[PDB]
Amino acid sequence: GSHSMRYFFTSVSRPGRGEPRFIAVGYVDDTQFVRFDSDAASQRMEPRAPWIEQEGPEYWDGETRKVKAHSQTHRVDLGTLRGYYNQSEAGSHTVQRMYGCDVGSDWRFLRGYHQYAYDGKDYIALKEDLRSWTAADMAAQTTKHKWEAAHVAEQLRAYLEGTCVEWLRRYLENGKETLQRTDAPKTHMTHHAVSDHEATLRCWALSFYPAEITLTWQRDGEDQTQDTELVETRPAGDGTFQKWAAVVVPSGQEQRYTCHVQHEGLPKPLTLRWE
C-alpha cells in the first residue's frame, strides 16, 4: 500500500527558565522510530523502534548533528517571531514544524509537505507544487519574501522528492517485519443494561495496525451516524491501536443493530450482531 515518513518538531520558549524546550520525533506510517529531547541527558537522536537500532554510528552521529541544527534554528526563530508580533519577553510561545513525504502503492513519490505554525496556528507552508509558499498573515509575508528571494523552496523540493522517499523506502525494507505488516482488529461486543428498558451495545476493535479504521452502527441497514458515540482511535502502548463505537438500544431491539468494521488487515469487512 501507500506509505509516509514524517518528522514533527516542537519548540517552546521558557522565559527565565533557561533554554527553550525542543522535542523532535520521526515516524514511518503510524510507527515512531526516533526522538530527540533537549532536556534529556544524552543530547543525541535516539532509536524508538527495533529495526532502526541496526543503523551504525555514522547514521546516529549524522542525525544527532542535524537535529541539533534544527534545534538552533528553532531557538533563533522564537526570537524572530516575538519581534514580528511585538510580544513581550515574559510569555511562553510555541513553534511547530512538520515535514515529510508520501509514496503511493507503487512506492514512488506522491506528495511532499513542509508546514510551520506559531502559537497553534498556521504561519507558513509549502504549497503542493513545492515551488511556492502560503503565508497565513501579514508577518509571514516577510518570511515568504525572504524565502522566495533565497530560493529556499528549491532545495527543500529536492529533499522531499528525492532523499525523503529514498530513506522512506530504505526504512520500509529494513523494518519490513514491523512496517509492511497489518494487525487486523480483534473484535467483540458488550451489552450493559442502562435501565430496565435500554441497553448500551459497545462494538470493540483492539490490537490493530495501522491506525486507520472505520467502525459504524446500522439499524435495519440504515446509518446511525447521529446516534453513535465514537471515541477517538487511541494507542495501546505496544504499537497497536484501539477504538470503540456504542449505541443505546431499546431493550428487545438488539437484533436490528449491526456493527460494521473496515480495516486493511481484514480479508473482508466484518459485520457483528448481538445474537
Binding site: E63, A69, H70, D77, T143, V152, T163
Partner: peptide
C-alpha cells in the same frame, strides 16, 4: 533521515 539544510525564519 533529516533534511540537512534548514533555513531560518
Amino acid at each position: 533521515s533529516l533534511y540537512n539544510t534548514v533555513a531560518t525564519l
